Structure formats: structure tokens, C-alpha cells
Amino acid sequence: KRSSKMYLKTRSQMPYKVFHYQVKIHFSGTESNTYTNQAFEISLYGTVAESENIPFTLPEVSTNKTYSFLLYTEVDIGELLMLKLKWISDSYFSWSNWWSSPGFDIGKIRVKAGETQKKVIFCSREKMSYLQKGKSPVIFVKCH
Amino acid sequence: DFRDIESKFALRTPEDTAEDTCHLIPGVTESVANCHFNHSSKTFVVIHGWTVTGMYESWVPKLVAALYKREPDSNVIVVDWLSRAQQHYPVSAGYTKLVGQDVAKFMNWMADEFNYPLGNVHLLGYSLGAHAAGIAGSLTNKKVNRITGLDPAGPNFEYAEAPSRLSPDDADFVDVLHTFTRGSPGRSIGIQKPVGHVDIYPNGGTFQPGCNIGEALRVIAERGLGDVDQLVKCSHERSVHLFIDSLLNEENPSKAYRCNSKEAFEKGLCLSCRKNRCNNMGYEINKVRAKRSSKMYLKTRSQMPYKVFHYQVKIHFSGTESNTYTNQAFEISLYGTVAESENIPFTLPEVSTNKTYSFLLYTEVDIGELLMLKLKWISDSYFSWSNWWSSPGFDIGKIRVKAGETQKKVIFCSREKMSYLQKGKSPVIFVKCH
Amino acid sequence: KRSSKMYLKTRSQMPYKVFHYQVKIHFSGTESNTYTNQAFEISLYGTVAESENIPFTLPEVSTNKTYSFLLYTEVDIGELLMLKLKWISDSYFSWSNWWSSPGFDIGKIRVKAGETQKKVIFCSREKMSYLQKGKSPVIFVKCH
């Protein structure tokens, strides 16, 4: 009935044909000091191939609040089993490796497959999450 | 009362063993006429199991092709776990009840409209499918002849009861292939508690040979990323491969043996079957009822033919020197009238004197009868250091090997004086005697 | 004054000259079901090079008890910053990825450098340890 805009992404030149796996996060932690302009790095493994070090950005991070973003990969993955949620920093060295750095807690994750509508519910482990800056990622699995 | 099916029943044919062409919708009799269904012949029902992907596993086509090869002019039905099994694994455990109710309704509708004899249907069950069939049939009014499953699932089924898991009363006859049981009780994928009238525990269920370590690393290798995922699934598909191999090779079925425990079978004191024991395995299994759970054991080759023999042995060790030794490796070889093995080893600790021992041996080649034997005793001092000075030795008298498939108490027989078995020495020959 | 036995390890053939970094663990958890004949995999990173996937064995694992073992590496590392404490299993697939598998808690670690006597006190993070079977390792750092 009217103009219908559209959007997508693509690879560099040869095959194009990228996927879309937008994500939601139910951030819920204790410390309520809001932060902004922070870089989130995640990775995913599936049943055909796997990406390793794909980054993304999400400012205005808060608590007791849900966020979302768009992610793209350039390799077929089919289904997806586990996830990585590393949080990067510019203080790699052991200066910021002991003293209390800001951290949050992760509950569930609601990634949604693009080509096929799959509300797969990712699922933090019993207690082993406590996402923190300059720390190892937090694993997740299929659940529910 | 046929609108909550949500599980389409397919019907393949020998010319098409890959893609589902028909859809036998319950209640709607039109499908039966649409797709030929010989109401006189036997009809199997394959129930696959959980799949991370959204398609049938790679074994269904081979299974169905072999099924047609074995029993032509017989209908085959496949189910559509898909759309429900893709969900979380516990969700599939819950949905087993729904699928069982659905299958029971299907069979009841068939027995009402067409009164097809229930004594001519198999509920071939794999993975979760075995438990699905087991919970099924029980709701059926006229019971089911055979419910032969494959590798019944362990989780959420141990510490359960008949209504919630496969039970011997779920059908007239039942048999399972416990192809994997390694791990703690109640947490190993493969249920270890015996379920059917007769159960089969190839290799003891610890693992299977036709595979390797598998996953080299979490990221470098392919855990479930295809490739080495099948290798990781070393045994879970070995059940179906064994079943299809037995189905194809109807002439010479493998003879699994009945015993008391895996260790007892390894020792080899529980092979003779004068009574109704040591029944066949596979399609040609002999239908039998037991007063209780009846465990069984056997061995197998790597992947293709399987169908190995069993030639357990006894030794009447009797020597002079009385210094006991332990954890020693015995190597033997045998020659027959069809073929011969060369360098098959085995182990026997706690060796002593004036005492008789026994063990279990297996070979993977047909031999028929057996003429002579080798009894070499190996060492880790090959070089001429331990080639002269007196090394421990024993004396050998008679040998009482017993053929498995055919009960033959052939009495092997040492020569007049030419035995004196010794470490790091040539074997001792033996012959038929007495 | 008498016979004095000695011991060591070595590489395969060419350089030999391996190190020795024996370790102690102060296992302290809640669930008291003892386990035996389990395989522990650890890895370490330093200031010169790093090993990746060195395994070792430790049966008779219990709770509220301290254990120790001997580890060897075949590459110079100098100092050591962080540690890996993965616990391996023979149920890689997602069968044993959700339902509660046995797990323990890790406090401090008391590795001791061989060539130079250094009672470096490794140190679990605030709460992010909960070592569990078939799970990502637990990171550790220099501390105290």
C-alpha cells in the first residue's frame, strides 16, 4: 500500500549471503552504577561451523533492564549449542586483574534465528556466570 | 478425536527409502487406499529419536532398505518426531507420552477400521523412540508382538516404572541392545537396568571398538559440528548397525551368550547353553519367556561383518617351580580347516602352579575345526640378555578348549616331553588327542 | 652418609631439560559424594611462553581435603600469571550439558616453582569458580 523499506547485511565481495541472529539480554545484577559506551564480544558454536571472535557494541548498559542488538555472521552454522559472552577492556595487564572491577549477572538469553523463526532460550548455568570486565566469557547452553 | 495428532506417519517403499511420499492420516481412511498397504503381510514401525538437526538421522534409509531386503511385500511406517524433538531434550522426554498416546490411537484406529492383526507389527525403537514405543502399546487393547528397541535412553527413565518407561509387559516379546553404559548409575545415557525378557550387552556396554578418541579439542575438532560428531557417537549407532547387519546376514546369525555378569563372561565359565540359553540376536532371535531379567554378553568385529566366534579355554598348569607370578601376558594362536589366526593375544594374571585357569578368547574369522595350537609367552626383554640365564618356566599337560557355537569338548594334548613353556621362548605345539 | 636416590622427568629426545611445577589444591565444596579415578586437565600461561592442553590424573578426590600432584612442562615459561583447571568427561555431547553434574568449589592454589623456590599463591576470583564436570575451566591469577 506504500513504500516498504528493507535492510540486511552482507559479506565482503564473493558469496555475500550472510545470516542474522539478533539477540536479547535480560541483564539483572546487584551493583547499580550505570556504564555507557562499552564493547561486548560474543562467539557461538553450532552443528556445521562456528565463529570465534565476532564483536559488537552496546552503550547505555544498566541493571534490571533488558537490551537487544543485531549480530551477523558470514558462515553457515545451522543450529547453535553454546555461546560466549566475553567483555573486553583496555587494561589487559594484571593491573586490573585483581581489584574489584565492575560486573553483572546473567540469567537467560533469547536469541532468535533469522531465516527460521526459532525462539531458542539460552540459559545460564546454576551459578557460574558473574560476567565481569576483563574476565573469561560466560558459557551458555540450550535449555528449557 | 483425531485432530491432536501432530505427528505424521509416513510409508516408504523399496524404490524410495529417502523421502516420505505418503501420509497415513489417522481416521481419514483415504490414505490407506491412496498408498498400497498389504493388510495380510507384516508391518514394521520405525521410531527414531532426538536429533539436533531438523531431519532424519543418516541410518534410517539403510535400516529401511535392509528391512525390505529381508522381508519384501511388507509395509513400513515412519514417524515424524520432527517439530517436537528439536525442542530441549527434557521437553522430548515429556513429549514421549504424547507420541506414545498418538501411536496407540493410530494402532487402535487401525484395529477398529481394518482390524489388522496386532501380532504382525514391530515397534522398532531407538534412542528415545524405544521408550516412546514402550509407553505405547500398553494403551493398546490387543497388545503387540514385538517391541524390539535399540539403545534405550537412560536419563529421566531410571528410577521409574512401567507406565513411564519401557517394560516387559508393554508387549508380548521384547529385546534391547544395551550398546553403551559407561558412567555412573542413573547418569549414563544408556540405561543399564535390564528391561526386556532378554537383553543384550555387546562388549559389556563399556564402549565399542569401531572408533577412536574422537574430539581432539572443543574448538579445533567438531563436537557436534558434524565431522567427528559421528565418531563421538561411537556406540549409540552401533546398535542399529548391528541390527541391520544381522538382518542382512540371515544365514549365519551371531550367537550371543547368556551369563551371570560381565566379569563372569570375561572369565569364560558361562558359555555352555544346554537349556534355553545363548539365544540368537537380531531378527532371527528365538521368542522366549523368562522368570526374570536375563542378561547376556558377546563380542564383535570392528564394523562391517561382526559375527565373531567364541572359543574359551582352560589350562591345567602343573609345574615344579612354585614362585607365583602376576599380571603376565599370554599369546596364543590356532590353526583349523578353513582359515587360521596368527598373533591373537590375551591376558591372565595371578598365575600359579598345580592350579587350573580359564579365560575367554575371540576370533573374527571362520575356522571350523581346529587342529593345532600355539602358546607363546611374551616378555619385554627380547634381546639376548634374557635368552640364556634361567628364566621362569612351567609345564603344560592337557588343554580343554570348548567350541562355542557347537559344543565340542576337544581335548588338546601336549606332546610326550616337548613342552616346558618358558618366558621369551618359542611357543608349545599341541594337537588333537584322546 | 648413605645411598641418595633422585628423580626427574625429560622431553622426548633432543633438548631434554624439562621443568617441575608441582601443585596443591585446597578442595572445599558442599556436596560430599566422593569420586575416584578422575582426569584433571590444567593449563598455564607465563611471561615467555605457555602450554595449552597438558593433562594429569588425580584419583580419590574428596571434599574438605587438600591434594597435590606433580606436573611437568617442556617449554620455558619464566613467571606464571593465570591458570586453567578444566575437568574432562566422556560425555561431551549435550546429554550431560544441562542436568546437574557433580561439581566442587575452588579457593586458593599453592603451586611451587621448582628451579626457583616461589610459593606463589594462586587465588580464585570472588565467586566465579564452581568447578564442574564437562564445563569451562576456572581462571586464576596472582594474588595475596
Numbering used by the authors:
A (entry chain C), C (entry chain B): 326 to 469
B (entry chain A): 36 to 469
Original paper wording:
LPL is a secreted lipase that is active in the blood, where it is the primary enzyme that hydrolyzes triglycerides from circulating lipoproteins such as chylomicrons. Before secretion, LPL is stored in sphingomyelin-rich vesicles, and insulin signals the trafficking of these secretory vesicles out of cells and into circulation. Earlier studies reported that at high concentrations, LPL was present in a “cryptic” or inactive storage form in secretory vesicles. The storage of high concentrations of LPL in an ordered but inactive form presents many potential biological advantages, including preventing lipase activity before secretion, avoiding the aggregation of concentrated LPL, and quick postprandial delivery of lipase to the bloodstream.
Building off these in situ observations, we returned to cryo-EM and found conditions to enrich the 11-nm LPL filament on grids and solve a 4.2-Å resolution structure. The higher resolution cryo-EM structure reveals that the 11-nm-diameter LPL helix is assembled from inactive dimers of LPL that are very similar to those that are the basis for the 25-nm helix. As was seen in the 25-nm LPL filament, the base subunit of the 11-nm LPL helix is a dihedral dimer of LPL. The filament is made of repeating pairs of LPL molecules with occluded active sites, rendering the LPL inactive. Another difference between the structures is the resolution of the flexible lid of LPL, which was poorly resolved in the 25-nm-diameter structure. Thus, the LPL lid domain may be less mobile in the narrower interior of the thinner filament. The known heparan-binding residues of LPL are located on outside of the filament. The tomography was performed on human cell vesicles expressing human LPL, while the cryo-EM images are of bovine LPL, a 94% identical ortholog that is more readily purified. The subtomogram average and high-resolution cryo-EM structures both have similar outer diameters and hollow centers. Thus, LPL is stored within vesicles as filaments, which are 11 nm in diameter, and composed of inactive LPL dimers.
